[PDB]
């Protein structure tokens, strides 16, 4: 489903548990290498509360596994992604997503 491929290791001790916002600079990409989303272009970190189901489930389960300041990668299968319906107008249905996750800080 969701597997992590570390790009740059973080601290390895502080992990975001249930109950706090997860602040992250993500760079989502399609399976063909055509980038569909990012956050550093908007220059504002993507702040989402953990466990409130405010983000796609693959990103949700991936964000818990790594630690502070860990640049990683996530291979979002269609099961834990938008999947059957996709994202209307952006993501085609039944597509794999790749994320250059970077949990920069916690609050």
């Amino acid at each position: 489903g969701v597997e992590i491929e570390t790009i740059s290791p973080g601290d390895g001790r502080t992990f975001p548990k249930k109950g706090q916002t997860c602040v992250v600079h993500y760079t989502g990409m399609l399976q063909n290498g055509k980038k569909f989303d990012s956050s550093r272009d908007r220059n504002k970190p993507f702040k989402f509360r953990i466990g409130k189901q405010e983000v796609i489930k693959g990103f949700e389960e991936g964000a818990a596994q790594m630690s502070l300041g860990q640049r990683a990668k996530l291979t979002c299968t269609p099961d834990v992604a938008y999947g059957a319906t996709g994202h209307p107008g952006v993501i085609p249905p039944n597509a794999t997503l790749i994320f250059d996750v970077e949990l920069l800080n916690l609050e």
């Binding site: 399609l30 063909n32 055509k34 996709g86 209307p88 107008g89 952006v90 993501i91 085609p92």
Partner: peptide, 12 residues
């Protein structure tokens, strides 16, 4: 407008 964007834009 939605059908055009549904079929043209996501494919890239």
């Amino acid at each position: 407008q939605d059908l055009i964007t549904e079929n043209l834009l996501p494919g890239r």
